[PDB]
């Protein structure tokens, strides 16, 4: 059962430092090497470096002066540290294991990633508002408006992951305020409105905020 | 430093037909009679997933429909027949020298029969109006193609510059898109007018659909 999970701050100020930790299980770091790969939002994949089983450490030549990669075999942790952070170091940061340990310098198993924004601006949790269903027994639409958070991202589930089908969580937009906003909708059948209750759970790791919100109509 | 040029940047293919994606290396990525060339599939909110290793070897659990070919500096990823779940961005990378580089990616759109949107509209919540701002959200659910026009009217008055759109990634199951246009007003400007209207022009509709509410009404 091979797993890797990245953890780090989410927000860092320009010219400051960044420390990320990749926690692995289901295999020994004595045998397999592990890469750091980042993806700037909208754009594509950039290789940062690698730490092999034996401890040999390879860096992308263009960033070698700012990068530091280390590990602890006993605690199953791999570390990345980057200095002199500018705005275009803003990206999702992934750790990926060497493909089958064959040293082809490809990747099999990746973590889900950790988002990092580089900006002086302060963290700010979201405000959540209902998008209540109208006076339509066919198919009815409701949702949650997640407003004025920074930085990205937020994750939106429904009824603690119970309701999955019909859900559409829209990409965030940058408002003129310099804060982010998205809407998350669900297309349920008309009948289920009086009977069953709909709660949207909103998560913002950077501010450590968790907001559940009941979505009902009526009461004019 | 080896560059990989991926083409085309984006590609549309019909269910059941063939997709051909190209990767051109600025130097040979061959050594000892093997080509150090790999292909990944990245769907939204997920990390990349290797489909092809060493130019032509198919990762186990990946369907027969995918195959890689080429050598030296010219490589291809082929899909046939293309399925709904193939809607993703595809990336090539090499390991001939350091640093490892990737192509800029090829985004694959899955073509399907024209389908019109299910339009809805949402008034500003009571608790948002307390803070001092008002958001009016118009939903266009599960349509195709992606080209859509959303027009806002406030008391039959054509609006511009005070709305923002956001489109989802193509759906894995039905190959449709959804869109949320959000009109932003102050509490004052909102309380000043009455009828709020969203007008949708889409190829799959015979003439523009409109949904509207009046402030106060349920």
């Amino acid at each position: 059962e091979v797993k890797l999970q990245e953890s780090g701050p989410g927000l860092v100020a320009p010219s400051q430092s960044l420390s990320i930790t990749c926690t692995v299980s289901g295999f020994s770091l004595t045998g397999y090497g592990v890469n750091w790969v980042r993806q700037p939002p909208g754009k594509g994949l950039e290789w940062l470096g690698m730490i092999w089983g034996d401890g040999i450490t390879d860096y992308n030549s263009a960033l070698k002066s700012r990068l530091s990669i280390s590990k602890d075999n006993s605690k199953s942790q791999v570390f990345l540290k980057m200095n002199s952070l500018q705005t275009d170091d803003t990206a999702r940061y992934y750790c990926a294991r060497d493909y089958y340990g064959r040293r082809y310098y490809a990747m099999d198993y990746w973590g889900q990633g950790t988002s990092v924004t580089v900006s002086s601006a302060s963290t700010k949790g979201p405000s959540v508002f209902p998008l209540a269903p109208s006076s339509k027994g066919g198919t009815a639409a409701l949702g949650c408006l997640v407003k004025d958070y920074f930085p990205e991202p937020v994750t939106v589930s429904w009824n603690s992951g119970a309701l999955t089908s019909g859900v559409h969580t829209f990409p965030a937009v940058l408002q003129s305020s310099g804060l982010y906003s998205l809407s998350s909708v669900v297309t349920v059948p008309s009948s289920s409105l009086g009977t069953q209750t709909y709660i949207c759970n909103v998560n913002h790791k950077p501010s450590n905020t968790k907001v559940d919100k009941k979505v009902e109509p009526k009461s004019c | 430093d080896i560059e990989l040029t991926q083409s085309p940047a984006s590609l549309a293919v019909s269910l059941g037909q063939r997709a051909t994606i190209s990767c051109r290396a600025s130097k040979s990525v061959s050594s000892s009679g093997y080509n150090y060339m790999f292909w990944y599939q990245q769907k939204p909110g997920q990390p990349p997933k290797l489909l092809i290793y060493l130019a032509s070897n198919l990762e186990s659990g990946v369907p027969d429909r995918f195959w890689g070919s080429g050598s030296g500096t010219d490589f291809t990823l082929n899909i046939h027949p293309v399925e709904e779940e193939d809607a993703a961005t595809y990336y090539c990378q090499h390991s001939r020298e350091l640093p490892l580089t990737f192509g800029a990616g090829t985004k694959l759109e899955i073509k399907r029969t024209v389908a019109a949107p299910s339009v809805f509209i949402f008034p500003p919540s009571d608790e948002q109006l307390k803070s001092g701002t008002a958001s009016v959200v118009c939903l266009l659910n599960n349509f195709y193609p992606r080209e859509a026009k959303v027009q806002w009217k406030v008391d039959n008055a054509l609006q511009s510059g005070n709305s923002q759109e956001s489109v989802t990634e193509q759906d894995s199951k039905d190959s449709t898109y959804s869109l949320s246009s959000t009109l932003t007003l102050s509490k004052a400007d909102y309380e000043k007018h009455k009828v709020y209207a969203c007008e949708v022009t889409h190829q799959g509709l015979s003439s523009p659909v409109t949904k509207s509410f009046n402030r106060g009404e349920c």
Binding site: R102, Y104, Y105 | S32, Y36
Partner: peptide, 10 residues
Amino acid sequence: QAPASPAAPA
């Protein structure tokens, strides 16, 4: 029988 990536420690 494919050897390791030439870009890897040998």
